[PDB]
Amino acid sequence: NNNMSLQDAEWYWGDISREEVNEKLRDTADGTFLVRDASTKMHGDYTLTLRKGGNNKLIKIFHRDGKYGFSDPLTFSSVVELINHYRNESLAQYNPKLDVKLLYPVSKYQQDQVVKEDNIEAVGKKLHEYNTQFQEKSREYDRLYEEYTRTSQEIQMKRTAIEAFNETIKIFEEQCQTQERYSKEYIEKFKREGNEKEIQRIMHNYDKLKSRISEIIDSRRRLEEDLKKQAAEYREIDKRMNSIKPDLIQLRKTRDQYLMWLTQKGVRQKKLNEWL
């Protein structure tokens, strides 16, 4: 009675693509498996897909003259028997380097039931609820990703300008230290003998330097305050994108599971592109 039909097994999936099985074994415990039809689309081939060691192993099931199995001594009556022989004995009996059992079958009726109410009057409305809420999120997500890269490029322009002030201020201050020690103890004091040279030539010059030196330090400080404010709004736009991104994987999964259990299976309906 454990040898039921292969078409009613929970771990058998028919013809699904290789890239659609990679979305079902992604980050699962070593021992998860399912069976599907071989990629050639000749019937009676039945590739097994096993999760082991972080990878997805891919094992072929051969079909000599009404027998099944892995190697050339085919000694099983059917696929459902072969799968059950290894849900209790490890696969090391086939390949010693493949020491694992078939533990956690990826069932078809565990997650397909995630959708409910197989009416067509119901799921059409539940598809309309999700297709509106889903694409309203993407209009709120990809807007933030637009404001995010623009705020990133304006942070980087400001930080380069701050380095331009730091190099500019660094040459004035070295220019006032040569004004005095290079010139204002050995030419000013030496020839101070009742001159009109002091108050205009040296003093009036050096006092318009310091007026110019500090005017540079007041534009640096005004820019440094708009960078602190600009780097704070850049972390608030990165918090909001981290709380919208999780909500928007859940909607796509709860929304796509409707399109492939009522509108394509319960009824062959060309209204799905008309529902939406």
């Binding site: 060691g53 380069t160 331009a164 010059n205 918090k239 981290n242 994987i249």
Partner: protein, 969 residues
């Protein structure tokens, strides 16, 4: 027209005023007269022995040794100057400012990097640069002309016999011009010659008819030359006048006039060239691998939306895990500290030479039932060995990268390695176990000892042949990996099976990797089309990648290297260390051939806005631009002209965004009339084809288009003295706002398809026009002369018979039949090509048709089905009326049955070359294009080419998809 503060060398300040077009000599001369009206002006000296120094907009303290620059070319930060005395090498400070202008960043920023891998690269790459300058300088001045004007030939001297039949008895007729009189006496000389004679035998007859060589042959209108000995019909010029019915026009110059326009150039070593115990083997450790996660500096998560966070790690060998991944414990979002040793099921001596650690910070929301919802926040990758073969020890800090848009996996094993150079980002602290010594990876004499330690006819040679000829993305089961690995000594008989035998190795086992190394060391070389597969992200091992680079350097010609230069620049992002054999090969080629060097430059330059690759690519641009010779002045003029157009079109996008075509089109003629805009944008080489030299702009014809992003139609004169034979106007679209990387790849594939069809015996004529990407969503498009969209022809001609009546109106009588067979052999190419690539939304705004009947498609955009991740063809009844010569029963004529035989033959010949097209897409996965992100996105090509079916079940799949796109709308 600006006040400039000047800091004299005696502590005195001045306010000088100058006009903005003044050189430095002018302002400097004017400064030491205005300075004698100031107190201590007797300390100063003569104007010479002094120079200026200032700050630039890139935050650079810049010394202006080049006194002829002017006040507006300087890009100052603030308007001030300062006088000092000149300390430094003068000829060397001038070259650093030219190099820093070409690549877009100061060269001084490279000196301030402390990574010793970066400083080893800079002085060790100067060894390649010196061996090439000695090579393009060996036999002069001939070898110096071959560098600047290299032969544009075909790979193969044999003509396809369907091309040979267009030449009567293997004869060609050529017109050899000669300018004789001082007042431009243009004489012509029409000859008839065998298609395989060399240009010294063509000249030999043009002299007898006019009654070492002293002459060269040039292509009239575009300064291409025939300098090296080849059969005449192998140059792409003569080869393309045989298969278009046109006449070749060649002009007979003299060697002394070409050798004298070659400015001499010399390479001198830079400043940084002169500048600058107990070890345990990897295979003596005895312990598992373990890593400690200390803490994260900060993460931007809300407290009321996310419950916990944790760190997810894994060990990887190029995309595949070497063991199962390991999490940390879940902590609250406000206290990210773990202080935790993680244990891996990998044993230390079993780590391969290209292992990496891949980690992300992830959050758990859950909160609803049991199916937890996991989402990555930031990712980062680390090499476990460094570039000197040393296992990493001790504490480490790592700034992480933002998740790519459109990704939801938890790790990112395909991203780049290293820290985010931005430092106000999430920083994670690590700790690597210390084994009381420096641990090195073994050397290949120790590895060959181990192979010879852990170490007959058969009839299943037919299973090895079937596996050998299979797709590079075809499934491989566990039984075939066991079969491949056990017959590994007979696989050297099928040398093209090496890509499949490498995916059967266990890389987390050092016994098997040691046997693989000894087996690659004796492997027979393979075709360069098959060795390019070994250079994508599935083959990280450095012994495998050097085998691949050695097959290119023996069997790849300059013709095919130009064909494949886009893909060879994307696989540089996959190499794990800066200094490697692929980068030495590509740099050697670009310094011996300027046609290759031109496009090598622009492909790296357009990706400098990308922070994951900018330092890698910047160091390599610095090295090319330092040894490219006198060609750096031409490149500098193309960068100035492109930056003028980017600044101009930015004004039209955010200041005139709402105005009308009258007020905008007058602003444009204002801006372009200015005499500085008029010197940047006039007299430079075209980036789309550096043989086409642009001349005087034609302002009356330049216009603002009405397309999506409002590009620029621009128009130049061809300044050649025999321009009238070739074209006379270079018309180019400048577009700013569209990504042009999907179009470069589409237009490159079509040029490969056409070459497969030409070599089969078909003549389906494609039109792969020029397209180049110059920066972040900015590019250039070649314009085709004498062409109209289908939509113009339908409006000007006003119905379904409009196109056929237009096409008879243009050519009458004897040439109505050639216009119908060229529309038909063109429509069959773009019908097959657009189906295989998944290109949709074809309408009469993006299909164009010439006067002679030829047809082509433009403005592709999205190539694979990127939207859905039917809309029957609406022009079907319009092209049927053309194909059947305007008959009444279109879909039943003998002419429509020949349309179908050509599509079937063209579909089945591309399906025989499916591996070439799978690899060219595989090499682009890290490029960054949104359509092409995973190996799941390349699966579209395996469906349209019906690779899992047979050859008769595939053709019925093509006929069944074409019939569904029949009359439709």
């Amino acid at each position: 027209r600006i006040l400039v503060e000047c800091l004299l060398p005696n502590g005195m300040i001045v306010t000088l005023e100058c006009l903005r077009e003044a050189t430095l000599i002018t302002i400097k001369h004017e400064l030491f007269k205005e300075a004698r009206k100031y107190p201590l002006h007797q300390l100063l000296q003569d104007e010479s022995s002094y120079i200026f120094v200032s700050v630039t907009q890139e935050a650079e303290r810049e010394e202006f040794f080049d006194e002829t620059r002017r006040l507006c070319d300087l890009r100052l930060f603030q308007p001030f100057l300062k006088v000092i005395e000149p300390v430094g090498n003068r000829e060397e400070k001038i070259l650093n400012r030219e190099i820093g202008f070409a690549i877009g960043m100061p060269v001084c920023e490279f000196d301030m990097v402390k990574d010793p891998e970066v400083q080893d690269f800079r002085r060790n790459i100067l060894n390649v640069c010196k061996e090439a300058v000695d090579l393009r300088d060996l036999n002069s001045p001939h070898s110096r002309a071959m560098y600047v004007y290299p032969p544009n030939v075909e790979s193969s001297p044999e003509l396809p016999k369907h091309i040979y039949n267009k030449l009567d008895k293997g004869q060609i007729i050529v017109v050899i011009w000669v300018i004789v009189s001082p007042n431009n006496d243009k004489q012509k000389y029409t000859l008839k010659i065998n298609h395989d004679c060399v240009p010294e035998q063509v000249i030999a007859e043009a002299i007898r008819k006019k009654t070492q060589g002293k002459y060269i042959l040039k292509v009239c209108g575009c300064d291409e030359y025939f300098l090296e000995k080849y059969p005449l019909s192998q140059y792409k010029y003569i080869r393309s006048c045989i298969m278009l019915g046109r006449m070749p026009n060649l002009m007979l110059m003299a060697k002394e006039s070409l050798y004298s326009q070659l400015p001499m150039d010399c390479f001198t070593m830079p400043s940084y060239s002169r500048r600058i115990t107990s070890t345990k083997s990897l295979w003596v450790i005895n312990s598992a691998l373990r890593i400690k996660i200390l803490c994260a500096t900060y993460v931007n998560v809300n407290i009321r939306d996310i419950d916990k966070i944790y760190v997810r790690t894994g060990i990887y060998h190029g995309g595949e895990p070497l063991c199962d991944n390991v999490n940390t414990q879940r902590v609250p979002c406000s206290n990210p500290r773990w202080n935790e040793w993680l244990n891996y099921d990998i044993y230390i001596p079993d780590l391969p030479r290209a292992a990496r650690l891949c980690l992300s910070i992830c959050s758990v929301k859950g909160r609803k039932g049991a199916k937890e919802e996991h989402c990555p926040l930031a990712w980062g990758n680390i090499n476990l060995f460094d570039y000197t073969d040393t296992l990493v020890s001790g504490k480490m800090a790592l700034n992480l990268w933002p998740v790519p848009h459109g990704l939801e996996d938890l790790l990112n094993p395909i991203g780049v390695t290293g820290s985010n150079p931005n430092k106000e980002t999430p920083c994670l602290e690590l700790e690597f176990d210390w084994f009381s010594s420096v641990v090195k990876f073994p050397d290949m004499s120790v590895i060959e000892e181990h192979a010879n330690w852990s170490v007959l006819r058969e009839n299943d040679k037919e299973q090895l042949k079937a596996i050998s000829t299979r797709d590079p993305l075809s499934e491989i089961t566990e039984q075939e990996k066991d079969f491949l690995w056990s017959h590994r000594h007979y696989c050297v008989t099928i040398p093209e099976i090496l890509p499949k035998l490498l995916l059967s190795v266990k890389w987390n086992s050092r016994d098997e990797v040691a046997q693989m190394y000894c087996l690659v060391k004796d492997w027979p070389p393979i075709k360069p089309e098959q060795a390019m597969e070994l250079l994508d992200c599935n083959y990280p091992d450095p012994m495998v990648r050097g085998f691949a680079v050695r097959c290119l350097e023996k069997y790849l010609t300059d013709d095919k290297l130009s064909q494949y230069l886009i893909q060879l620049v994307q696989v540089l992002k996959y190499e794990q260390y800066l200094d490697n054999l692929l980068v030495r090969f590509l740099l050697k080629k670009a310094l011996t051939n300027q046609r290759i060097g031109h496009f090598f430059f622009w492909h790296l330059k357009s990706e400098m806005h990308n922070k994951t690759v900018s330092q890698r690519f910047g160091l390599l641009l610095e090295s090319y631009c330092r040894a490219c010779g006198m060609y750096l002045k031409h490149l500098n003029r193309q960068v100035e002209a492109m930056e003028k157009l980017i600044n101009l079109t930015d004004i039209l996008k955010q200041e005139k965004k709402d105005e009308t075509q009258k007020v905008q089109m007058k602003f444009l003629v204002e801006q372009m009339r200015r005499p500085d805009f008029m010197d940047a944008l006039q007299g430079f080489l075209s980036p789309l084809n550096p043989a086409h030299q642009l001349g005087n702009l034609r302002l009356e014809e330049c216009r603002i288009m009405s397309s999506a992003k409002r590009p620029l139609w621009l128009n130049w004169e061809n300044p050649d003295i025999m321009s009238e034979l070739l074209f006379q106007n270079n018309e180019i679209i400048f577009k700013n706002g569209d990504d042009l990387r999907q179009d470069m790849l589409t237009l490159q594939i079509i040029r490969i398809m056409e070459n497969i069809w030409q070599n089969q015996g078909l003549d389906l004529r494609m039109l792969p026009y020029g397209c180049l990407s110059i920066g972040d969503c900015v590019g250039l498009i070649e314009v085709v002369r004498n062409s109209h969209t289908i939509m113009q022809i339908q409006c000007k001609g006003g119905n379904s018979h409009t196109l056929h009546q237009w096409l008879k109106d243009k050519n009458k009588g004897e040439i109505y039949d050639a216009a119908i067979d060229l529309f038909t052999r063109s429509c069959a190419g773009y019908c097959v090509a657009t189906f295989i690539l998944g290109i949709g939304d074809r309408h009469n705004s993006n299909i164009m048709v010439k006067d002679d009947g030829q047809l082509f498609h433009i403005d592709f955009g999205h190539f694979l089905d990127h939207k859905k991740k039917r809309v029957p063809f609406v022009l079907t009844q319009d092209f049927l009326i053309v194909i059947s010569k305007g008959a009444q029963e279109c879909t039943k004529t003998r002419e429509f049955e020949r349309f179908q035989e050509m599509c079937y033959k063209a579909y089945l010949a591309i399906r025989q070359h499916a591996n070439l097209f799978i690899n060219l897409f595989s090499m682009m996965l890290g490029s960054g294009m949104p359509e092409l992100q995973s190996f799941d996105d390349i699966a579209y090509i395996r469906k349209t080419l019906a690779l899992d079916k047979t050859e008769q079940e595939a053709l019925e799949y093509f006929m069944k998809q074409m019939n569904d796109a029949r009359h439709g709308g």
